[PDB]
């Protein structure tokens, strides 16, 4: 994401980005 | 010429320090090319400096290939060249 948003503000005419957040779901077996 | 321009000189007499940094810069900013091909008689400095900037070469352009085979958008290709080069020479 750090190469992505630097190609796309720099296009599509400071920023700080913070560390992305993992969402994971599945459809396996329920316990 | 009548333009106006700071004074450089007094700023150098108080400040030669951060003067000598600040000119070293702006002489490696306009370096030019040397003329002289390296040889097996130059200094090991030299040859060392030489592979230095080799290596640093090959590192840029290691990563804007790298960078231009991923092909993150599939998309103004002086906007894109000057974004490759902002974020391989951060990276």
Redesign the interface.
């Given at each position: 994401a750090?190469?992505?948003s630097?190609?796309?503000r720099?296009?599509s005419?400071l920023n700080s980005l913070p560390t992305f957040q993992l969402i994971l779901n599945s459809n396996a077996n329920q316990i | 010429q009548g333009t106006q321009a700071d004074d450089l000189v007094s700023a150098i007499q108080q400040n030669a320090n951060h003067f000598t940094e600040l000119f070293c810069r702006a002489i490696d900013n306009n370096m030019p090319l040397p003329t002289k091909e390296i040889d097996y008689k130059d200094d090991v400095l030299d040859v060392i400096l030489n592979q230095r900037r080799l290596r640093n070469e090959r590192m840029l352009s290691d990563r804007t290939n790298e960078?231009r085979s991923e092909n993150?958008?599939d998309?103004?290709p002086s906007?894109?060249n000057?974004?490759?080069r902002?974020?391989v020479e951060?990276?």
């Amino acid at each position: 994401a750090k190469r992505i948003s630097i190609l796309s503000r720099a296009q599509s005419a400071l920023n700080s980005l913070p560390t992305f957040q993992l969402i994971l779901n599945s459809n396996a077996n329920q316990i | 010429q009548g333009t106006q321009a700071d004074d450089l000189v007094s700023a150098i007499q108080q400040n030669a320090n951060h003067f000598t940094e600040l000119f070293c810069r702006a002489i490696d900013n306009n370096m030019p090319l040397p003329t002289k091909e390296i040889d097996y008689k130059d200094d090991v400095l030299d040859v060392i400096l030489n592979q230095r900037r080799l290596r640093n070469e090959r590192m840029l352009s290691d990563r804007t290939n790298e960078i231009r085979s991923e092909n993150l958008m599939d998309t103004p290709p002086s906007s894109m060249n000057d974004a490759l080069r902002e974020v391989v020479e951060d990276e």
